[PDB]
Design a binder for these strands. Structure first.
Lengths: 453, 1313
DNA sequence: TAGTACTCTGCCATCAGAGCAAGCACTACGGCCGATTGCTC
DNA sequence: GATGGCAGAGTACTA
RNA sequence: GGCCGUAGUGCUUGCUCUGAGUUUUAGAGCUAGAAAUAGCAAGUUAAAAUAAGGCUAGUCCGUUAUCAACUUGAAAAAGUGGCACCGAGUCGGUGCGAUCGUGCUCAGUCUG
C-alpha cells in the first residue's frame, strides 16, 4: 500500500528522476586540462550486443543524447559476476585525473554508525535509484562526458553525452552529497525527533516509536517526491526493527554482522598462494572489529603476506585459520555508541601486542563500542613490562580519536602511570601532550579487566 | 618484477651472457613459439652464448682496389702510345692494332690473320728466327743506325712502357758508370788532389769486393773504414764513402758548418742540398761530390747489369741477351751429358711435365728453386759438371729473362734505352721526332701520392680538386690538377680535431702559439725559493715575461742556474727562425702572428720544395731571396693535440681573457691549463661543455666503427650491445642492478725469417750459414730464441748447441708470478735458469755486468728490443722494488684496457640516462669490469675446472661466473667501487693478494666464518653452505641457448686461379665473349645464400612437368641479378611456374631440426654442418681435467698427491665417457665408420697410462662437436672428416629462425609446403 | 643393359716487395693539474 | 689454416 | 683521466708504385710407319685479361663494415611474445592470471 500513497517518490512508478531544485552545475578544469579524445576500443560481437539493448533503453529515458564534443573516452563493458548482462561502464580514466580536485566531504563508514543511538529502535532504510543521474549537468560542461558509440543496427553513431552526473566520475559522490544535504537540511528542521543518517546516496531515518517511523516515512517520501529523487521500492526496509545498512545488521540498537558475510570467510578453503591469503586477510579485515584481539589471532598469517617469502602453511598457520573460523561463528553483538556520553577505555598488553575495548554506559551495563588492537612498534615491544603499558594505552587511545568524535573520555588501567608520564626517566613529549590533555583525556580508577572480555 | 644482473664475457668470436637473481640462481621462463607448427611454447634457461665468424680488416680490400687502379692505368698508357702511333700505323699496316687486341682468340673467333705482327707465316717465322726474344730487338734498335720497321719500333716501345721499373731512385742515372774499382780510384785521386796536406792511400784494397759485399751497408762501410788508413768513421773520406754507398752522412764536422747539411744521394732534394753545401763551403768540392755520385751509380748498377757497357748503349738488353746465350749453351751441354751418362732419365728430365726438371721448368709451373733442388743430385752424380755445379750454387744456371729478381731494375735504364731508340729512329720518322718528349713523359709519369685518385665527384676515396674541367692526361696534369690544394686536403682529411672543440682542427706541434703555451704551462708551476722569503712564492706575470724574454727568446735550452744568474742575479721553433730571417722585431711583433702561423703551417703541410716555394710566394716581398730559400729548406713535422681556438680564441665571459692571457697573467694564483678548464667560476668549462653538446652522438654502429681496435673486437662489442638490449626487453623492460663484463686479452714465420736475416747481416755473424733453418722450423719457440740469441747463452758467457736443444730452459726476465707475459720480448733461452740468481726478482747484478756488452750488441743488431734490454738491465737501475711488486700484483686484478673502458662507457650511456635536479646522472645500473684472473682463480680454487674441447658451454659458464664474482665482490667491499665500477707498499700488497679470500673457508690456518656479511650492514654477500651448491647446479644444467649468427656471404666471386680449358659445366667465363670450354675460367663460386624454390621442371624427352622442391645456391656474382628479377632468374635456370610466396631466403648457418633433436646447419647449397652440443656431466669434465694435467701441475705437493689418487680410484670413468660419446654420436652424429674406427682405436689403446689415455680422449670430442666436421687423431690412428654433402633430408625438417639470444623462435615446417 | 643418380675420398686454394701520411695503444720513466670541515689564532 | 668445391671412382635403381 | 720531454714497440686507415704468377693465341716440328707408335730435334719470348661487370662515363666504382622471423613504412626506422613453484639429458610438469571513502599490512623518501 506504500507504493500507492506516494506515486511521486517510487522509481517503479515515478519514472526518471530530476533534481528540480539544484541548478545545472559547471564542472571546472585545471590549467593543463585539455579535451583528450580516445578512440573507442575494440569490443567483442557478443559484448557490443550486451550493451546495445541498454543503450536503446537508456536513449528512451533521455540519459544519452547525441552530441559533437572534443572530449571522448572509450566505453567498456563489464560482465556481471553472475550470468551475463554486460553492464555499460564509461571508463573515464583520463578525464577523472584531469578534472579539478574537490575535497571529499563524504562521511566515512566508521563514524556514521556512531551517530545512531540505541534509544531510536525503529528504522527505515531508503535507497536512491539512479542517484547520480538526478543532478542535471550544464550544457557548457556537457561536452566533457561524451563517449564514442556506434550502432549500425539503428544507424546511430557519434558521441553520446550525459546531461546528468555520470558514474565513474571522481566528484560524483561529492557533488551529490552536498546537493542532497541542502535539500534534506530543511526536512531535519521540521522533524527534530527523527534521526536521518545519510551515506552518499543511502538515507536512514531513525525514530523512537513505530508510528513516528511511519509518519516520518510518509513525510520523507513526499519531500523527496517534490525534489524529484526516486526511491527504490524493491529494496527499501521500511518500519522494520531489523534492517541492513552499511554492511551491518541493526538489531535492538546493536551492530551485528551479516550471516552471509560470516559464511564467506569460513567457506574459503585453506589458502595456498600469497594472493589466496591476501583475499582472506582483507575479507576478514572487515570483521576485525567484532573479534577482540583479532590482531593476535591473525598474528602468524601477517608475515606470510610479505611479497618476498615462502608460503609454508605450517600447523601453526592452520591453527590461526581455525581460530578465525571458530571466532566468527560466535561473534557477539556490538552495541551502537552514544556521542552524548563519556567513554571508558580498557587497555591491556601481553607480549608486544595491545588490545582493548572502547565502551560506553548503557543502562547499568557497559556496552562495547569497538574492539581496538594494534601491534607495538619494535622499540616499545622490547621494553620491560611496566612501561610497555604506556605505549599500550597510547596506541589504543589513538584509535579512540576516530570514533569518539573528539568527545572527552576516561582511561582506566591496572597500573597508575599518569605520574610516570609527567616524569619519565621527542616522541615522549608527543605522548605527554596527548595523555595529559585534560579536555579530552582522563585517568580513571585502577582496575583489572576481564582476560577474555 | 625482480632485481637481476647481467653477466657478459666477450670474445673475438663469441659472446656469452647470463641473467642471475639475488641468490645467484639463473631464472627460467616459458617462451612462446611462433610459426605453423603444433609447438606453441618452450621452456628455456636465461643462460647461453652467441657465436659468430671473426671480423676482418680492410687490408685485402685496399690491396685489391690498388691493383685494379694499377691495371687500369697501365692499359691507359698503352692506349696513349697507340694514339701517338695511330696515323702512321694506319698508313703502314691498318689492322696491326686490331690483330694485337685479338691475340687472345681462337682461330675461328679471330676476324683477322692468326699471326699478329706481320700477318703471314713466312714473315712471322723469319721475325721469330731473327729475334728470339724482345731483348734482341731492343738491342738491335738501340745500336743499329739504319731504318727499322714501324711495327718493330712500336713493339719495343710498348714493352718498355708496359714494364717500366721501380721508382725508388730519384734523379738521373748514367749507365756508363759500371766499373767500381776505376771509379773508387778516381775518387781517391780527386780526394788526394784537393786535400793535399793529408793525402789518402787506398792501394792494395779490394774496393770492389768490399763495397759490393752482400752484408749490410753499415757493415760494408765499417769494413772499408777498417781496411783504409788515414781516416775513420765521421771523417770527410768516411762521409764521402757513406754517401756513395747510400748512407746519409753529416758533413757538419768536416767543415765546422755548425749545421747538419745532411745529403742523401737518392733523394730528390739532393741537388738543392748540394747547392746549399757548396755555397756554404766552396766550389772546389764539386768534383769530389760528382765522383761520389758516379761511384754510387756504379755501385748500384753493377749488382744488376753485370755486363760490359763500353761497347753498347743497352746494358740491360745486353745482359738479358748474354743470359739467353748462357742458357742455350748450358742446355746443350746438359743434353749431351745426360745422353752420354744416364740416357734412361732423359725422358723424365726433358719430357715429363709433371715431375720437376726442364720440362716442368719451362712448360710446367715449377720455379727456379724447385728446378735447382731437383737437378742438383743429378749434376753431382755425374762427371764434367763442375762448372755447372758452380753456376747452380751461385744461382746462375738456365735463367729465363723474366724472373722474380727483375724487381731491382730502375725505370731510368728503360728510359735511357727508349731515349736511345727515339734518337736513332727520328731521322726517318718526323712524327717520332716531334713526340719524343711526350713519349718519355708517358714512360716516366706517375700520379703523386698526395693527389690521389683522379675522380670527378663519384668516389669516396678521392680528395683531388681540379682547377679546370677537362680530361686529365699526363701532359696537362700540372695545368689541370691543383697540386697545392690537393696536398693540403690530403693532409687535412686525416688529422685530428680538438677533443674539447670537436669542430676545430689541431695546431701544428711546432707552431709558435703551441710553443708559447707549453713553455708558459711549464713555467707557471715553478716556485722559486731564495733569501728573504718567508714562504715559497709563485712567479708573477711580469716576472715570467722577463724570464721568457731574457732566457727562452735567447738560448735554446734554459736551465735553473741560467735563470738564477741572468735574472735572479743580473736583474733581481723561435730560434730556428731567428737565425734564418735575422729579424727580431718581426718575430716579436703582434700583428704578424698570422703570418708566422701561416709559415709554420705551410712547412708542416707540404713536403715538396716546389709546393712550399709556390705557397710562400705571397710573403716573398717581406723577406729576401736568400731568406725565402732558407725557409724552403727548413721543414717541420708533427701535429699538436690542442686547437688554436681553444688556446687563444675563446675568452672568459667575466674578464674577456683567453687561456693564454690568463696563463701569462696568472699572478699569485699561477693556475695551469687543467685548473683553468676545471674551474667552476671560470666560464671555460661551460663553453667547452656547450661545444661538446653540439653534434651529440651518432648511431651505435657509427660509434663502434669510430672506435679504435681490432675489427673482430668491434664486432663482438656490437653483438654484446644488441644482446643487452634484447635481454632487457625479455626481462620485462626492467633494467638490471649490475652489468659485469670481461674481455679476453686476444705470415709470422716469414717475418721471423726476415728479422733473423737482418739481425745476422747487421751483426756480421754466419749462424744461419752454419746451418740454415726454414720458416716452419723457425716457428719453434726454442729454436727462435736460440737463433735470436746468436747461438750463445744470455745469462752467462758460453755457447749453446742447436743439436742439444729441447733440453735447456726458457726463463722470463720478469718473474711469471708478477707479470704473465709469454712473449719473446720477455722469454729468454739459457742453459740453466739458476744463472739468473734469485727466482723472484730481476737477474742478478753480476750477470747483468757480465752480459751488458753482449746485450748491447744484440740491441744494436735489432735482435732484442729496447724494452727487453731495459728489463734485462733493471738490476743496475735498482731491480724490482717493493712498490713495483705491489703495482704488478694490483694490476693483475684491475682492468686497465682502453677497449674495455670504451665498452663500459657505451653500455653505461645506453643504460643510465636520467638526471637529478642538479643535472647529476643517477647510477641506476652499475657497470663492473673484471679481469679473467679472478674467475680463473675461482675455478682453480673451488674445482670448477674448464675444458674447452668438450663443447661451447664454457662461454656461458664464464659469463655466469663473471656475474657471480663481480656481484659478490661489490657487495662485500663497497670501497672497491672506485677501481671496478665505471664512473703503504706492504699494506697495498697484502690487500689485493687476499681480496678473494672471503670465498674460501680456510686461509693459509684461519677458520673463516661460514656466512659472509658485509660488515657495518646486515647484508649476506655469500653463504659457503649453499651458494657453492647453487653454482655447481647452475654449471651442470644441460640446456644452454647456443646460437650461431647467420650471415650472408659477401666478397670475392670465386677462387682467383684460372684453370685451363676442360669440358666441364663448372667453369665460369672470364669475359662475356670467352667460352670456358675453349678458354678456361674460374671455378668454385662462393654461395651468397640458398633459396628454397618449389616449382616444376621438364624431365625426360617428353619434358613432363615434375614437381620439385630443392635448394638453389645464389652465388655472389649473380645475387644482384637474382634480386632484380627473381622470376626471370629462376625461369632461366629451367624451373617453370615457381611460387614467389614459397620462395624462402636461407643464409649461412640456417638451422634445421630433423628428428630426435638432430640439428643441421646450412653450410652451403650442398653441404651441412653439425648443430648439436654434448652436455657432458661436470664429474666427467673434472676427471678429464685432472687426469690430463691441464697447464701441467700448479698445486701443492700435498694437494697434488691426493688428486692423483682421485684419478687412480676413478680410472673407470674413461669407459663411461666413451659410452656417452658413442650414444651421442649414434643419436645425432650418425658417422658409423668413424665411430667404429674410434672405438677400435680406444679398445686397442686400453693398456696405456691414464694420463696418455685422457690426453688422447680429449681429442675425441672433435668427432662430436658443433660446426664443420674436422679430422682428428687418436694416438697413431687418424680419423678423417665425415662431411654431409647432401641437403635432401632437410626438405622435410623444421626451419628455426632464432633471435640474437635464441629465446625468440619462429619454426617453419617445410614439409607442408 | 644404359643411363642417370647419389656417395665417398683426396687435392686444393695468387704471391712477394717500395715509399708516403695520419692516427691509436702500450711500455718506461719524470714533472705538473680536488673540496670540505674542524681546529686554532 | 680451414673449410667448401670439384674431379673421379664406386655402387644402386630405373626405363 | 691530460699534456709536456725522451726513447721504443705493435697495430690501423688511406694513397701511389714494382716484380712475378695464371689463362688463350703466335713462335710451320722432322723422319719411319695405314694407323696407333717409335726415334730425334726444339724449349728462354710476345699480345691480351687479371674479379663478370656498372653508369654517374671518371685515367671513376666493384671482395671492409652492416643483415633472425612477422607487421607498419619509399626508405631511414619503429613495434610484435604473462608469472610463480618443483625438477633436469638439450628442457619438462604443476598452479595462478572506472571512481570516493573506510579497515589492515608493508615499503620508500624527507626532516629532526
Amino acid at each position: 500500500t506504500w507504493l500507492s500513497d506516494f506515486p511521486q517518490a517510487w522509481a517503479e512508478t515515478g519514472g526518471m528522476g530530476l533534481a528540480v531544485r539544484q541548478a545545472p552545475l559547471i564542472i571546472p578544469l585545471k590549467a593543463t586540462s585539455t579535451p583528450v579524445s580516445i578512440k573507442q576500443y575494440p569490443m567483442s560481437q557478443e559484448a557490443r550486443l550486451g550493451i546495445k539493448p541498454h543503450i536503446q533503453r537508456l536513449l528512451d529515458q533521455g540519459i544519452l543524447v547525441p552530441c559533437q564534443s572534443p572530449w571522448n573516452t572509450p566505453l567498456l563493458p563489464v560482465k556481471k559476476p553472475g550470468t551475463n548482462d554486460y553492464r555499460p561502464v564509461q571508463d573515464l580514466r583520463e578525464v577523472n585525473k584531469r578534472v579539478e580536485d574537490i575535497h571529499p566531504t563524504v562521511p566515512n563508514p566508521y563514524n556514521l554508525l556512531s551517530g545512531l543511538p540505541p534509544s531510536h529502535q525503529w528504522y527505515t532504510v531508503l535507497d536512491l535509484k539512479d542517484a547520480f543521474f538526478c543532478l542535471r549537468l550544464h550544457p557548457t560542461s556537457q561536452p566533457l562526458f561524451a563517449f564514442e558509440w556506434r550502432d549500425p543496427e539503428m544507424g546511430i553513431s557519434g558521441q553520446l553525452t550525459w546531461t546528468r552526473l555520470p558514474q565513474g566520475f571522481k566528484n560524483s559522490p561529492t557533488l551529490f552529497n552536498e546537493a542532497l544535504h541542502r535539500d534534506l537540511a530543511d526536512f531535519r528542521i521540521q522533524h527534530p525527533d527523527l534521526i536521518l543518517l545519510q551515506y552518499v546516496d543511502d538515507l536512514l531515518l531513525a525514530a523512537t516509536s513505530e508510528l513516528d517511523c511511519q509518519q516520518g516515512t510518509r513525510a520523507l517520501l513526499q519531500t523527496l517526491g517534490n525534489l524529484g529523487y526516486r526511491a527504490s521500492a524493491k529494496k527499501a526496509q521500511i518500519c522494520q526493527k531489523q534492517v541492513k545498512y552499511l554492511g551491518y545488521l541493526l538489531k535492538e540498537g546493536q551492530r551485528w554482522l551479516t550471516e552471509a558475510r560470516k559464511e564467506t570467510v569460513m567457506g574459503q578453503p585453506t589458502p595456498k598462494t600469497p594472493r589466496q591469503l591476501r583475499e582472506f586477510l582483507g575479507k576478514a579485515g572487515f570483521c576485525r572489529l567484532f573479534i577482540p584481539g583479532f590482531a593476535e589471532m591473525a598474528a602468524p598469517l601477517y608475515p606470510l603476506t610479505k611479497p618476498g617469502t615462502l608460503f609454508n602453511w605450517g600447523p601453526d598457520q592452520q591453527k590461526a585459520y581455525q581460530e578465525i573460523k571458530q571466532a566468527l561463528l560466535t561473534a557477539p553483538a556490538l552495541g551502537l555508541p552514544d556521542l552524548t556520553k563519556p567513554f571508558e577505555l580498557f587497555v591491556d598488553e601481553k607480549q608486544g601486542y595491545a588490545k582493548g575495548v572502547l565502551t560506553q554506559k548503557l543502562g547499568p551495563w557497559r556496552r562495547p563500542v569497538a574492539y581496538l588492537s594494534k601491534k607495538l612498534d619494535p622499540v616499545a615491544a622490547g621494553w620491560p613490562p611496566c612501561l610497555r603499558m604506556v605505549a599500550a594505552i597510547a596506541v589504543l587511545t589513538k584509535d579512540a580519536g576516530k570514533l569518539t568524535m573528539g568527545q572527552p573520555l576516561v582511561i582506566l588501567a591496572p597500573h597508575a602511570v599518569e605520574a610516570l608520564v609527567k616524569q619519565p626517566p621527542a616522541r615522549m613529549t608527543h605522548y605527554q601532550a596527548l595523555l595529559l590533555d585534560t579536555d579530552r583525556v582522563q585517568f580513571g580508577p585502577v582496575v583489572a579487566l576481564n582476560p577474555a572480555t | 618484477d625482480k632485481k637481476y644482473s647481467i653477466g657478459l664475457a666477450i670474445g673475438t668470436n663469441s659472446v656469452g651472457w647470463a641473467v642471475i637473481t639475488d641468490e645467484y640462481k639463473v631464472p627460467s621462463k616459458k617462451f612462446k613459439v611462433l610459426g605453423n607448427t603444433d609447438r606453441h611454447s618452450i621452456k628455456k634457461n636465461l643462460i647461453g652464448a652467441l657465436l659468430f665468424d671473426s671480423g676482418e680488416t680492410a687490408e685485402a680490400t685496399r690491396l685489391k682496389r690498388t691493383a685494379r687502379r694499377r691495371y687500369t692505368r697501365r692499359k691507359n698508357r698503352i692506349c696513349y702510345l697507340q694514339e701517338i702511333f695511330s696515323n702512321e700505323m694506319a698508313k703502314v699496316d691498318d689492322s696491326f692494332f686490331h690483330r694485337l687486341e685479338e691475340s687472345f682468340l681462337v682461330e675461328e673467333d679471330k676476324k683477322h690473320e692468326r699471326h699478329p705482327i706481320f700477318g703471314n707465316i713466312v714473315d712471322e717465322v723469319a721475325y721469330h728466327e731473327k729475334y728470339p726474344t724482345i731483348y734482341h730487338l731492343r738491342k738491335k734498335l738501340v745500336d743499329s743506325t739504319d731504318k727499322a720497321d714501324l711495327r718493330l719500333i712500336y713493339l719495343a716501345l710498348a714493352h718498355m712502357i708496359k714494364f717500366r721499373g721501380h721508382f725508388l731512385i730519384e734523379g738521373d742515372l748514367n749507365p756508363d758508370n759500371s766499373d767500381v774499382d776505376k771509379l773508387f780510384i778516381q775518387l781517391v785521386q780527386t780526394y788526394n788532389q784537393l786535400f793535399e796536406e793529408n793525402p789518402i792511400n787506398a792501394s792494395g784494397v779490394d774496393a770492389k769486393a768490399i763495397l759490393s759485399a752482400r752484408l749490410s751497408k753499415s757493415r760494408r762501410l765499417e769494413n772499408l773504414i777498417a781496411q783504409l788508413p788515414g781516416e775513420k768513421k765521421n771523417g770527410l773520406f768516411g762521409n764521402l764513402i757513406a754517401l756513395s754507398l747510400g748512407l746519409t752522412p753529416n758533413f757538419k764536422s768536416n767543415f765546422d758548418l755548425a749545421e747538419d747539411a745532411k745529403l742523401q744521394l737518392s733523394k730528390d732534394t739532393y741537388d738543392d742540398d748540394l747547392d746549399n753545401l757548396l755555397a756554404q763551403i766552396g766550389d772546389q768540392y764539386a768534383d769530389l761530390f760528382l765522383a761520389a755520385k758516379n761511384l754510387s751509380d756504379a755501385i748500384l748498377l753493377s749488382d744488376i747489369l753485370r755486363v760490359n757497357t763500353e761497347i753498347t748503349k743497352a746494358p740491360l738488353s745486353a745482359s738479358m741477351i748474354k743470359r739467353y746465350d748462357e742458357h742455350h749453351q748450358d742446355l746443350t751441354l746438359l743434353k749431351a751429358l745426360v745422353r752420354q751418362q744416364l740416357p734412361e732419365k732423359y725422358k723424365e728430365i726433358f719430357f715429363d711435365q709433371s715431375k720437376n726438371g726442364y720440362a716442368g721448368y719451362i712448360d710446367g709451373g715449377a720455379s727456379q728453386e724447385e728446378f735447382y733442388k731437383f737437378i742438383k743430385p743429378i749434376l753431382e752424380k755425374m762427371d764434367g759438371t763442375e762448372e755447372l755445379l758452380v753456376k747452380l750454387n751461385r744461382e746462375d744456371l738456365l735463367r729465363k729473362q723474366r724472373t722474380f729478381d727483375n724487381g731491382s731494375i730502375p725505370h731510368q735504364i728503360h728510359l735511357g734505352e727508349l731515349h736511345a731508340i727515339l734518337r736513332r729512329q727520328e731521322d726517318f720518322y718526323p712524327f717520332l721526332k716531334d713526340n719524343r718528349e711526350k713519349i718519355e713523359k708517358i714512360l716516366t709519369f706517375r700520379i703523386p701520392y698526395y693527389v690521389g685518385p683522379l675522380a670527378r665527384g663519384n668516389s669516396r676515396f678521392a680528395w683531388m680538386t681540379r682547377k679546370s674541367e677537362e680530361t686529365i692526361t699526363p701532359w696537362n696534369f700540372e695545368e689541370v690538377v691543383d697540386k697545392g690544394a690537393s696536398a693540403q686536403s690530403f693532409i687535412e682529411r686525416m688529422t685530428n680535431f680538438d677533443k674539447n672543440l670537436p669542430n676545430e682542427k689541431v695546431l701544428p706541434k711546432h707552431s709558435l702559439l703551441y710553443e708559447y703555451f707549453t713553455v708558459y704551462n711549464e713555467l707557471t708551476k715553478v716556485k722559486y725559493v731564495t733569501e728573504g722569503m718567508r714562504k715559497p712564492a709563485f712567479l708573477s706575470g711580469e716576472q715570467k715575461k722577463a724570464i721568457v724574454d731574457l732566457l727562452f727568446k735567447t738560448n735554446r735550452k734554459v736551465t735553473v742556474k741560467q735563470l738564477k744568474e741572468d735574472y735572479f742575479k743580473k736583474i733581481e721553433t723561435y730560434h730556428d727562425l731567428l737565425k734564418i730571417i735575422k729579424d727580431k722585431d718581426f718575430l716579436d711583433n703582434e700583428e704578424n702572428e698570422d703570418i708566422l702561423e701561416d709559415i709554420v703551417l705551410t712547412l708542416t703541410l707540404f713536403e715538396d720544395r716546389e709546393m712550399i716555394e709556390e705557397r710562400l710566394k705571397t710573403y716573398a716581398h717581406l723577406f729576401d731571396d736568400k731568406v725565402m730559400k732558407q725557409l724552403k729548406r727548413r721543414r717541420y713535422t708533427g701535429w699538436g693535440r690542442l686547437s688554436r681556438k681553444l688556446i687563444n680564441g675563446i675568452r672568459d665571459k667575466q674578464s674577456g681573457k683567453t687561456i693564454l692571457d690568463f696563463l701569462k697573467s696568472d699572478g699569485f694564483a699561477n693556475r695551469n691549463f687543467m685548473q683553468l678548464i676545471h674551474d667552476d667560476s671560470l666560464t671555460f668549462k661551460e663553453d667547452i661543455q656547450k661545444a661538446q653538446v653540439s653534434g651529440q652522438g651518432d648511431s651505435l654502429h657509427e660509434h663502434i666503427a669510430n672506435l679504435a681496435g681490432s675489427p673482430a673486437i668491434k664486432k663482438g662489442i656490437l653483438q654484446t650491445v644488441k644482446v643487452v638490449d634484447e635481454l632487457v626487453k625479455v626481462m620485462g623492460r626492467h633494467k638490471p642492478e649490475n652489468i659485469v663484463i670481461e674481455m679476453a686479452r686476444e705470415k709470422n714465420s716469414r717475418e721471423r725469417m726476415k728479422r733473423i736475416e737482418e739481425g745476422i747481416k747487421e751483426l756480421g755473424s754466419q749462424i744461419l750459414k752454419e746451418h740454415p733453418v726454414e720458416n716452419t722450423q723457425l716457428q719453434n719457440e726454442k729454436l727462435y730464441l736460440y737463433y735470436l740469441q746468436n747461438g750463445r747463452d744470455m745469462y752467462v758467457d758460453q755457447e749453446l748447441d742447436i743439436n742439444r736443444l729441447s733440453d735447456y730452459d726458457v726463463d722470463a726476465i720478469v718473474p711469471q708470478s708478477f707479470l704473465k707475459d709469454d712473449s719473446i720480448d720477455n722469454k729468454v733461452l739459457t742453459r740453466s735458469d739458476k744463472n739468473r740468481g734469485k727466482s723472484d726478482n730481476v737477474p742478478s747484478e753480476e750477470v747483468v755486468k757480465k752480459m751488458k756488452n753482449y746485450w748491447r750488441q744484440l740491441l744494436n743488431a735489432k735482435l732484442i728490443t729496447q724494452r727487453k734490454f731495459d728489463n734485462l738491465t733493471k738490476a743496475e737501475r735498482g731491480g724490482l722494488s717493493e712498490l713495483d711488486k705491489a703495482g704488478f700484483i694490483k694490476r693483475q686484478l684491475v682492468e686497465t684496457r682502453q677497449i674495455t673502458k670504451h665498452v663500459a662507457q657505451i653500455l653505461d650511456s645506453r643504460m643510465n640516462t636520467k638526471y637529478d635536479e642538479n643535472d647529476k646522472l643517477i647510477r641506476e645500473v652499475k657497470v663492473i669490469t673484471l679481469k679473467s684472473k679472478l674467475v680463473s682463480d675461482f675455478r682453480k680454487d673451488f674445482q670448477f675446472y674448464k675444458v674447452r674441447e668438450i663443447n661451447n658451454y664454457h662461454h656461458a659458464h664464464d659469463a655466469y661466473l663473471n656475474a657471480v664474482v663481480g656481484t659478490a665482490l661489490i657487495k662485500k667491499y663497497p670501497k672497491l667501487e672506485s677501481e671496478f665500477v665505471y664512473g703503504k707498499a706492504t699494506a697495498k700488497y697484502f690487500f689485493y693478494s687476499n681480496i678473494m679470500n672471503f670465498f674460501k673457508t680456510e686461509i693459509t690456518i684461519r677458520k673463516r666464518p661460514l656466512i659472509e656479511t658485509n660488515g657495518e650492514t646486515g647484508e649476506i654477500v655469500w653463504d659457503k653452505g649453499r651458494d657453492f651448491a647453487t653454482v655447481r647446479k647452475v654449471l651442470s644444467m644441460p640446456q644452454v641457448n647456443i646460437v650461431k649468427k647467420t650471415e650472408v656471404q659477401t666478397g670475392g666471386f670465386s677462387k682467383e686461379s684460372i684453370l685451363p680449358k676442360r669440358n666441364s659445366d663448372k667453369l665460369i667465363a672470364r669475359k662475356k665473349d670467352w667460352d670456358p670450354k675453349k678458354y678456361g675460367g674460374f671455378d668454385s663460386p662462393t654461395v651468397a645464400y640458398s633459396v628454397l624454390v618449389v616449382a616444376k621442371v621438364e624431365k625426360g624427352k617428353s619434358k613432363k612437368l615434375k614437381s620439385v622442391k630443392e635448394l638453389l645456391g645464389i652465388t655472389i656474382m649473380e645475387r644482384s641479378s637474382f634480386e632484380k628479377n627473381p622470376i626471370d632468374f629462376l625461369e632461366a635456370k629451367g624451373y617453370k611456374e615457381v611460387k614467389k610466396d614459397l620462395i624462402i631466403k636461407l643464409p649461412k648457418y640456417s638451422l634445421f631440426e630433423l628428428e630426435n633433436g638432430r640439428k643441421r646447419m646450412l653450410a652451403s647449397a650442398g653441404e651441412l654442418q653439425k648443430g648439436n652440443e654434448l652436455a657432458l656431466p661436470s664429474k666427467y669434465v673434472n676427471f678429464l681435467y685432472l687426469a690430463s694435467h691441464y697447464e701441467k701441475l700448479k698445486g701443492s705437493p700435498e694437494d697434488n698427491e691426493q688428486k692423483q689418487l682421485f684419478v687412480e680410484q676413478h680410472k673407470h670413468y674413461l669407459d663411461e665417457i666413451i659410452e656417452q660419446i658413442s650414444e651421442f654420436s649414434k643419436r645425432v652424429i650418425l658417422a658409423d665408420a668413424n665411430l667404429d674406427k674410434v672405438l677400435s682405436a680406444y679398445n686397442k689403446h686400453r693398456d696405456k697410462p691414464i694420463r696418455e689415455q685422457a690426453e688422447n680422449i680429449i681429442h675425441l670430442f672433435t668427432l662430436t662437436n658443433l660446426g664443420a666436421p674436422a679430422a682428428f687423431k687418436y694416438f697413431d690412428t687418424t680419423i678423417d672428416r665425415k662431411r654431409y654433402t647432401s641437403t635432401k633430408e632437410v626438405l622435410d625438417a623444421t626451419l628455426i629462425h632464432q633471435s640474437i639470444t635464441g629465446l625468440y623462435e619462429t619454426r617453419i615446417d617445410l614439409s607442408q609446403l
